[PDB]
Amino acid sequence: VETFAFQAEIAQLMSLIINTFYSNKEIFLRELISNSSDALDKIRYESLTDPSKLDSGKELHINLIPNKQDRTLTIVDTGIGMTKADLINNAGTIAKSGTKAFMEALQAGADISMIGQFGVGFYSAYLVAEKVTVITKHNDDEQYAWESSAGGSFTVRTDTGEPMGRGTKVILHLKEDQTEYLEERRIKEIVKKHSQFIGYPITLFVEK
Amino acid sequence: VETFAFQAEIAQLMSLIINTFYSNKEIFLRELISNSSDALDKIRYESLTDPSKLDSGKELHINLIPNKQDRTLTIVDTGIGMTKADLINNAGTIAKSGTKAFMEALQAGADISMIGQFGVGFYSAYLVAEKVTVITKHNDDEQYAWESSAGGSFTVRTDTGEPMGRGTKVILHLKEDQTEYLEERRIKEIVKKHSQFIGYPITLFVEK
């Protein structure tokens, strides 16, 4: 297990997401679905010039998986995935420059919901999650797990035994008071409100 | 000069953009600025692991250049640029799959302003332009010009004599009744309305 310090500006951003009073937390799902759609666009685009990039899976989709027993919401896509080097770049983000630009925007009247315009929308996961685990597989690397409970660090390790083929899984270990995001009715409502017209199918899995 | 047929679904999309009654044409600028911001994020991200990718220019920005004598509006960025192969892929888009998904969305109640969610927002240029010329330079290829006045085809040729260093210029040859988009007051209004909080600076050039 390798432990890395977050880029300072990201540590500050995460702090702001966790500590600022902001009731509209449901936008985390829009942001993670947007990231999945971007990852899916990338593999689709790459496949136009090299069809063998889909040998690791032809279906391009997003699955939403609530688990009330584990208190987790997982967002899975079959997009391009991330290499170990991507994960070491603050979970595949333009962390430093994006946060700096985002903070200047917040001072000029922007609000937290604009986070995705700055390339750091993944970190909106911390509106609802105490810990986030990212499992990912890119065609050019092995499967890895990235994890952070904030506090200024993240870990990276190889992930074996449950291979995915290609893509990214974002596992949200929800805060105790954010269990509404495990309810089917609530997830459907948020998808229709913010992610109604996406370039890929979204399947909401059922439990028990 | 090489001439290419558009992917059929793109030819249909362009037809729909040119012929459908839709008064909110100003969203073309939001879409082109969004594309520039995405291109700028890509070069910024690539530079995190290879700083020499900025040897072709360190400044990451967007310029908006109106020219009333030529009746053109140009959107310039210093993003990652496009290779010749990208241009041949319908001006660097997921043309086929994106248009198909976008058309299904329009039947389900989506409208033209959602075009950017489907990876084909560049084609919103045809809301206001009779012809579009794209000049582009990627670090791994030479400078090229892509052009189309719709009608089912586009051209690609090398572009010499006015080298850019790195990035993309989108030159909109405006329709005669769309000259409001050359007015400083109008461009400022549209940028503030739709692109107020972007991850990169936008400079609106002055004329005469």
Numbering used by the authors:
A (entry chain A), B (entry chain A): 17 to 224
Paper text:
Here we report the investigation of the role of protein flexibility in the modulation of binding kinetics and equilibrium thermodynamics of drug binding to heat shock protein 90 (HSP90). HSP90 is one of the most abundant proteins in the cytoplasm of eukaryotic cells, comprising 2–5% of cytosolic protein under non-stressed conditions. It is a ubiquitous molecular chaperone intimately involved in a variety of pathways, including cell signaling, proliferation and survival, and protein folding. The N-terminal domain of HSP90 (N-HSP90) contains the nucleotide-binding site, which has been the target site for drugs interfering with ATP binding and ATPase activity. The unbound N-HSP90 has a highly flexible lid segment comprising residues 107–14137.
We determined crystal structures of the N-HSP90-L107A mutant in the apo-state and in complexes with representative loop- (1, 6) and helix-binding compounds. A change of the conformational stability upon mutation must also cause alteration of the conformational ensemble of the unbound protein in the direction of higher population of the helical conformation (even if such conformations exist only transiently) relative to the loop conformation, which should facilitate binding of the helix-binders.
